[PDB]
Ligand binder design. Sequence first.
Ligand code: SF4
Ligand code: SF4
Ligand code: F3S
Ligand SMILES: [Mg+2]
Lengths: 265, 533
Amino acid sequence: GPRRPSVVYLHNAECTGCSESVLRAFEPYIDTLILDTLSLDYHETIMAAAGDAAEAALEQAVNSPHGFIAVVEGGIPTAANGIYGKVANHTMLDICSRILPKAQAVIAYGTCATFGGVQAAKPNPTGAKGVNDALKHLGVKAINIAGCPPNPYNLVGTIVYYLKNKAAPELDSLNRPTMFFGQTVHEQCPRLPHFDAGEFAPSFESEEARKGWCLYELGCKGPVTMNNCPKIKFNQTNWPVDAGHPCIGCSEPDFWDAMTPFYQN
Amino acid sequence: SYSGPIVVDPVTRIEGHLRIEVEVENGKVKNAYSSSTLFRGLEIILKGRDPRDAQHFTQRTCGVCTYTHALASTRCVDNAVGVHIPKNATYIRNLVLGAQYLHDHIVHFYHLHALDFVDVTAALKADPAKAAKVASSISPRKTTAADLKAVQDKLKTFVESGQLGPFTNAYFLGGHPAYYLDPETNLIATAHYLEALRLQVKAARAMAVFGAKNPHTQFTVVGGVTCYDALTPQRIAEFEALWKETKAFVDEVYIPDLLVVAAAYKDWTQYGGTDNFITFGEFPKDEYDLNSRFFKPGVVFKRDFKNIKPFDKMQIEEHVRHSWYEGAEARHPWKGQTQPKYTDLHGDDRYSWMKAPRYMGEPMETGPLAQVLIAYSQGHPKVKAVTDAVLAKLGVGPEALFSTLGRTAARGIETAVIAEYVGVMLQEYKDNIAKGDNVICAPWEMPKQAEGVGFVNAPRGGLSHWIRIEDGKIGNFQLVVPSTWTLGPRCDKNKLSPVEASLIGTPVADAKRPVEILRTVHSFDPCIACGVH
Ligand code: SF4
Ligand code: SF4
Ligand code: F3S
Ligand SMILES: [Mg+2]
């Protein structure tokens, strides 16, 4: 077959939920992605090599004359000269500073990588930053695919677009693809007619909640959140409001501080 | 044979950022250190916030053991406010947790652990007809030569591209003296690794049916759950179909593979043992009584399973003397402190971002081996039946369980038992709905001052979240997580943690490719984002 494009997947300050979301890929599935579509050349969660052998695999991939795409999960801890996060006894800040400027393209995958995420919430003891913020001085401009975790549809769609067109798709002012992030959750929500009618559930136990009334009074952040959740859904089957729970705003910068308390509007 | 240090950093095929250091003498490990190398500080971040918000933050402790921390935080706040959630909320929460166990353990065995035992490249040498006969002898599912040739053909194309991807620099490339499987068994395992990549999609989808999405579910609230659609016959049938398929894979694919690998690696009954075990129980009938759980809590010291001790939550203290936090004072988590202070590797004898939890001063293994051994010893009939059948198939005695192999087997045992029990819970839930109980959430009031604790036995063991509410806000919030118990460092009595102690005695055939260290470390299923938070 043809040479497959190389992907280097990095883990910074992360929970591995973004990695797990990629494993949920559907049509194409993850086996197709790593056997046919791409060459996954470094990924600490699933790779065979460990230790020195893993470091050597990383160096081999990064220095390849064929080039690579970087996918980055997690925020970069910057406090105290980066010491709150290390891999192979190098700071995550140093690792990303050395690798990411060499990539042909960088995708920041998940709200942590895009915007700083959960560890960047106040008081941000580790000085965590999103990729573009941390590395702006190096000229890194990662495509931001936000969410906690994002819809893996949005990662695969971005990669496929880039491979076909050799360019990023149209990006919004937060560097997110407009093809996925161009609409609010709310404008796509099945409960919108109740919102318009002023029909709000007053509590989770209420008959109004049972009947599917709008969750705005219970804190829903759909009106202020850009994502494709109601359209694509998750796991081919559901999404938060259809499970009766408000959106918490998880594709937005700083959402941990901007969208809290989660149960108020 | 090798004498000197070995460092494995990164330890791959775990969740999170782990550095293992060992001292080897004449080919065997004589000392070990478990160094967790990322800190986030979620407990610091939580201070001052609304207690209702905690579960949303703490779920992001870990996306491998997704849901578990949302459940622990919700149990914790439920407990603090004194709400008794409706029966259906317990059922739905329990069903989603059961589904999490199945997903997590399947992915662990195949996608995290198996590359320590399976030489994928050797599958290219296999005779697919012989392999199919072996596969069909160990499982009621029949596999043909053509089925396995399709895998071998796909693998051949991949390897002949020269782009080995996740297999680059694998310890098995070119052969390795510690890799024992024949080509045919390697092909069977590789085929099932690939199958499991697609099966786990279904296993995770089962959580989303009631729980909105996976990863990071969104259906729990203080007082119960939000998912009225989960009461419908259509959602229940969707869950049931996914569960049935997942259970079939457990029973027909995972367990037979686990047994065929264990039989080939029976020497691994000799390495990786531990002394003490703690477990919290799981799948309650009564949210306020741990002894109402399908698996019950318990504590065992020095392998004395005739004398299971009751679990006293006041006997937990988390040490910091060998951790990157201020001072040396251990704390009970209702008086916990999270005060980072980095000193670099071994600076002032500190080497990890994990705290070191101790129970009555002792280091405790938690996770599947603890849950299975304690339940067995409590007379749990399902755990006894499966465990005895596994020991008989392997031709080993109960002593074999105290090992790396045993721990790996216990993860399978747990998976099989829980897969069956999910069906029982599902039927009980259906029966409850049929009686006319359609309630899923109960009202509650926020106290200005309260203490609460929530207990979950997660896939890696006993998880507890601890809150002190002051002025209706989070005064203190402390997570004590299973991997903290198992993989945290030494305490102020200098006692090795379970993973550290278990590594003493490990043989290392090739110090450049120290797969034996990985086998033992991976058998605990480390989760470092969990352990540190
Ligand atoms: S964006 Fe969310 S799911 Fe992804 S690594 Fe961060 S905390 Fe985890
Ligand atoms: S439930 Fe949320 S997203 Fe839906 S209509 Fe109401 S406010 Fe909008
Ligand atoms: S919480 Fe996140 S997953 Fe979608 S529904 Fe709201 S943006
Ligand atoms: Mg803690």
